[PDB]
Amino acid sequence: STIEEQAKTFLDKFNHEAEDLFYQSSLASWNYNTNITEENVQNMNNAGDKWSAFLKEQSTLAQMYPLQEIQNLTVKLQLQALQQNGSSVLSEDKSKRLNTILNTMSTIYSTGKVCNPDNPQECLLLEPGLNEIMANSLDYNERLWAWESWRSEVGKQLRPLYEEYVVLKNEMARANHYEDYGDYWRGDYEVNGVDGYDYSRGQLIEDVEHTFEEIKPLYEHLHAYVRAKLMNAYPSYISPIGCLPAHLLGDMWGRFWTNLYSLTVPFGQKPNIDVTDAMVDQAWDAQRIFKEAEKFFVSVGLPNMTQGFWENSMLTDPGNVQKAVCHPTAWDLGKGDFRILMCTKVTMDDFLTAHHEMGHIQYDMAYAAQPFLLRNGANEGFHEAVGEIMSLSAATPKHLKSIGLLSPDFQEDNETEINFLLKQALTIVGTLPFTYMLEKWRWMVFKGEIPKDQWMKKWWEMKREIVGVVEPVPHDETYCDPASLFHVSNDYSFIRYYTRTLYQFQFQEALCQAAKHEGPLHKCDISNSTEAGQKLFNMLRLGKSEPWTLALENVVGAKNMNVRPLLNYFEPLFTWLKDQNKNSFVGWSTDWSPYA
Amino acid sequence: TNLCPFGEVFNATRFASVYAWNRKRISNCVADYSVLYNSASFSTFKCYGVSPTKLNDLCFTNVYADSFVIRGDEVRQIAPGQTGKIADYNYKLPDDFTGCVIAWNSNNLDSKVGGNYNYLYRLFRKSNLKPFERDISTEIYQAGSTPCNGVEGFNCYFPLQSYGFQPTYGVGYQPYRVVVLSFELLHAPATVCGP
Numbered sequence: 001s002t003i004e005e006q007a008k009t010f011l012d013k014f015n016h017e018a019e020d021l022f023y024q025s026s027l028a029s030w031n032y033n034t035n036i037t038e039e040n041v042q043n044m045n046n047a048g049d050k051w052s053a054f055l056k057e058q059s060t061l062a063q064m065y066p067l068q069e070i071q072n073l074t075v076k077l078q079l080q081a082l083q084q085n086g087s088s089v090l091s092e093d094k095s096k097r098l099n100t101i102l103n104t105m106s107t108i109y110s111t112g113k114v115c116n117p118d119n120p121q122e123c124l125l126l127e128p129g130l131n132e133i134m135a136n137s138l139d140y141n142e143r144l145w146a147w148e149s150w151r152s153e154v155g156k157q158l159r160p161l162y163e164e165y166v167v168l169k170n171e172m173a174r175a176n177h178y179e180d181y182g183d184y185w186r187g188d189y190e191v192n193g194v195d196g197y198d199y200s201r202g203q204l205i206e207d208v209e210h211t212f213e214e215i216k217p218l219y220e221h222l223h224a225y226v227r228a229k230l231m232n233a234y235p236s237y238i239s240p241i242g243c244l245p246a247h248l249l250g251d252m253w254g255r256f257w258t259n260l261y262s263l264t265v266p267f268g269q270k271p272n273i274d275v276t277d278a279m280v281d282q283a284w285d286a287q288r289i290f291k292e293a294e295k296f297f298v299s300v301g302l303p304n305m306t307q308g309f310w311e312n313s314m315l316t317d318p319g320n321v322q323k324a325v326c327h328p329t330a331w332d333l334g335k336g337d338f339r340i341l342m343c344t345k346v347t348m349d350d351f352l353t354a355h356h357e358m359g360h361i362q363y364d365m366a367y368a369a370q371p372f373l374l375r376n377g378a379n380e381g382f383h384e385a386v387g388e389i390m391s392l393s394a395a396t397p398k399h400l401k402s403i404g405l406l407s408p409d410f411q412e413d414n415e416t417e418i419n420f421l422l423k424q425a426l427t428i429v430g431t432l433p434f435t436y437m438l439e440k441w442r443w444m445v446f447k448g449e450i451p452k453d454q455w456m457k458k459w460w461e462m463k464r465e466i467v468g469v470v471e472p473v474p475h476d477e478t479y480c481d482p483a484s485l486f487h488v489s490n491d492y493s494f495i496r497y498y499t500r501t502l503y504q505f506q507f508q509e510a511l512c513q514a515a516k517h518e519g520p521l522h523k524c525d526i527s528n529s530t531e532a533g534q535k536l537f538n539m540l541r542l543g544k545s546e547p548w549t550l551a552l553e554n555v556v557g558a559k560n561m562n563v564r565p566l567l568n569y570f571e572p573l574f575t576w577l578k579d580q581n582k583n584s585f586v587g588w589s590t591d592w593s594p595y596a
Numbered sequence: 597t598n599l600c601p602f603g604e605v606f607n608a609t610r611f612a613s614v615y616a617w618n619r620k621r622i623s624n625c626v627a628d629y630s631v632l633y634n635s636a637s638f639s640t641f642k643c644y645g646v647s648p649t650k651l652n653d654l655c656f657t658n659v660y661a662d663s664f665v666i667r668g669d670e671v672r673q674i675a676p677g678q679t680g681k682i683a684d685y686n687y688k689l690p691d692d693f694t695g696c697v698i699a700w701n702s703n704n705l706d707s708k709v710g711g712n713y714n715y716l717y718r719l720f721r722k723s724n725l726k727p728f729e730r731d732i733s734t735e736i737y738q739a740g741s742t743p744c745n746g747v748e749g750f751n752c753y754f755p756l757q758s759y760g761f762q763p764t765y766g767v768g769y770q771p772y773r774v775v776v777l778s779f780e781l782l783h784a785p786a787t788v789c790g791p
């Protein structure tokens with residue numbers, strides 16, 4: 001028997017062993033997240049520890065089959081994915097050092113508090129305390145206090161830890177034969193040995209920068225229109241040609257400009273479409289919300305929700321005594337068990353989130369027949385892209401009228417369309433320079449292109465240059481402001497939110513073309529179109545079994561990430577913005593700062 | 597008017613594991629095949645060669661009733677000319693099979709919260725099974741070239757694996773009880789007819 005035949009047998013034992021341990025770990029995790037008790041914490045940690053230990057063992061056993069001698073590519077994918085596990089590459093001491101740094105940094109972020117001057121007992125956490133200030137407060141000084149206090153008392157704690165975190169992560173990445181830890185992260189998009197579909201780690205950097213260049217004209221005009229409206233509300237604080245102060249962007253970091261809508265709404269006399277009142281008028285409950293979401297996927301040819309889904313999911317808040325983690329999540333426990341955890345309220349926001357989360361379920365169900373290790377989205381951006389396009393179609397006035405929530409006597413005029421697209425652009429477009437710049441900074445830090453004594457200097461040089469955002473207070477190299485964001489201090493890659501954004505509009509444009517949609521792309525509803533559902537399902541059932549370049553091609557007919565559908569989505573706003581900024585400055589000077 | 601003991605097979609408390617499938621020989625009795633087919637309690641009732649429709653009007657020398665438990669997605673393997681873990685390693689029907697296959701969901705009996713590990717199946721075997729062959733061996737499967745020495749390790753795995761049935765599993769992973777009626781015809785007394 002050859003090395004490959006031994007590998008096929010090894011994966012057969014692994015699949016059936018992992019399938020069982022994963023189900024016990026997810027069940028224990030589910031039982032805590034629905035019934036929060038001390039004993040449920042113990043059960044999760046046990047089942048989770050046995051799952052992790054099983055992975056450490058099987059990862060070591062997988063390495064004894066050397067990849068060079070495997071030829072069945074679907075076998076090499078599973079063998080490779082199991083082999084890359086960084087616990088058994090560094091020394092025991094260095095791995096122990098790294099796990100302590102990661103846990104400390106996570107604890108500082110989640111327990112870090114800030115206490116207002118003259119009252120050392122009235123302190124605030126990031127959630128919900130400081131987040132409420134950055135999301136609702138219009139007072140310049142209160143926002144500046146929350147922005148600076150977070151970075152000066154929690155960020156400074158994280159700076160020495162992050163420096164050692166970079167050193168150890170690079171050692172682990174280099175020992176796995178990557179250039180650096182950023183190179184390791186870019187390996188999610190790597191494809192080898194498939195003619196016409198390969199993709200290198202370096203090619204991701206070029207494609208991100210190439211596509212970001214085409215985003216710049218739309219971002220420049222959105223930045224200009226936002227600056228003009230903010231300047232009307234804060235005349236003494238904002239330069240007509242300078243960057244936007246970092247503490248006036250709607251949240252703690254300016255990751256999304258969603259909460260700038262109140263001050264930047266183009267037509268404040270036209271209200272938003274909000275079917276929450278209609279749902280309550282018709283006595284909708286959570287079960288009706290998810291029944292409609294199930295109806296939506298059935299209309300395009302996707303399968304019913306399983307009987308276990310209705311019996312085993314938790315679609316309402318359990319009650320007073322019983323406590324649950326209410327963050328909406330879609331659970332793929334395996335063994336045919338699919339569930340949604342959601343503390344659903346009768347609102348339009350929860351109606352759309354149900355379509356988003358059930359979109360995750362449809363993806364999970366579609367690739368359930370794949371081997372265990374290939375049961376995932378084509379790359380890190382596919383799964384979230386699938387969920388987002390479901391809320392795109394479900395929120396259109398076309399869809400809301402057909403399901404009897406929006407009256408037939410509501411007609412969209414070009415002003416509510418512009419209101420909607422700007423609100424969309426504040427979240428979707430505003431995050432793209434933020435996402436690209438942050439991940440670019442981390443890539444260079446891992447590469448070594450930024451020395452430690454210039455981390456903060458370079459961090460705000462790029463914020464001014466790429467994002468058009470300026471710090472309101474000068475920050476020396478005792479600060480670590482990127483670490484003041486969850487993903488940076490909790491060791492999550494960030495470029496996924498950029499690639500996913502481009503994927504979702506590529507998906508929606510392709511599915512609307514299959515649905516024979518007539519009109520602007522943002523008004524499309526793929527409901528009742530089986531051709532659209534078939535086109536989506538052809539990719540969903542692939543999972544990770546095929547290169548993401550081929551999986552993308554199954555939906556859109558192109559092998560690479562493309563920014564054109566995103567610009568096609570926002571074209572009505574782009575022409576409006578350019579006409580709005582005819583007597584406004586477009587662009588920004590990087591030398592202006594609010595601290596003169 | 598001696599009635600065949602089908603109740604001992606269908607209404608048994610516990611079923612055999614598929615690798616160790618059971619076989620009850622049926623002889624010298626009257627069998628009412630119409631009661632089974634027209635009971636509607638079964639999710640699968642497919643007959644090959646013989647027909648289910650009032651074929652209690654025939655006579656056979658001996659009837660063999662094979663019973664075991666598998667998961668729902670493997671019931672399709674209890675059929676002529678099928679491949680897969682069950683059909684190749686646990687329980688194989690012949691191509692010329694003349695008989696019936698009966699199956700029904702048993703999540704209410706064979707599933708337990710936390711997992712029911714009573715039912716096993718064979719995951720590895722050096723070759724496929726001949727029809728109606730049974731293998732209950734627990735010898736460690738040798739996948740490599742180094743001898744295993746009766747314990748599992750690198751390229752050495754104990755062959756039998758468990759289902760671990762849980763009530764919250766999907767239908768495709770839920771336990772199904774299976775009865776496989778074999779109909780035998782020899783130049784022989786033909787002691788099983790049934791009106």
Ligand SMILES: *[C@@H]1O[C@H](CO)[C@@H](O[C@@H]2O[C@H](CO)[C@@H](O)[C@H](O)[C@H]2NC(C)=O)[C@H](O)[C@H]1NC(C)=O
Pocket residue numbers: 602603606607
């Ligand atoms: C297994 O047990 C069931 C229940 O006792 C049997 O079905 C019963 O059959 C009698 C007639 O003999 C009826 O009076 C009952 O109403 C039936 N009950 C149910 C629940 O079906 C069944 O026949 C038994 N299986 C076999 C093979 O004999």
Ligand SMILES: *[C@@H]1O[C@H](CO)[C@@H](O)[C@H](O)[C@H]1NC(C)=O
Pocket residue numbers: 035037039040322
């Ligand atoms: C969680 O709640 C269920 C009922 O909703 C109860 O039966 C169960 O015992 C609780 N779990 C724990 C671990 O206490």
Ligand SMILES: *[C@@H]1O[C@H](CO)[C@@H](O)[C@H](O)[C@H]1NC(C)=O
Pocket residue numbers: 008072073074075
């Ligand atoms: C890879 O192996 C699987 C099962 O061992 C087989 O079904 C498949 O055809 C193989 N693929 C190739 C390209 O040989």
Ligand SMILES: *[C@@H]1O[C@H](CO)[C@@H](O)[C@H](O)[C@H]1NC(C)=O
Pocket residue numbers: 303304305306307
């Ligand atoms: C879903 O609907 C189809 C008909 O379109 C039906 O055949 C199937 O049994 C249903 N599934 C469930 C779980 O209700």
Ligand SMILES: *[C@@H]1O[C@H](CO)[C@@H](O)[C@H](O)[C@H]1NC(C)=O
Pocket residue numbers: 299398399402403525527528
């Ligand atoms: C989908 O088709 C059904 C069946 O006629 C219809 O009632 C519903 O309004 C349609 N919805 C859309 C969005 O086309």
Ligand SMILES: [Zn+2]
Pocket residue numbers: 356357360384387
């Ligand atoms: Zn999601």
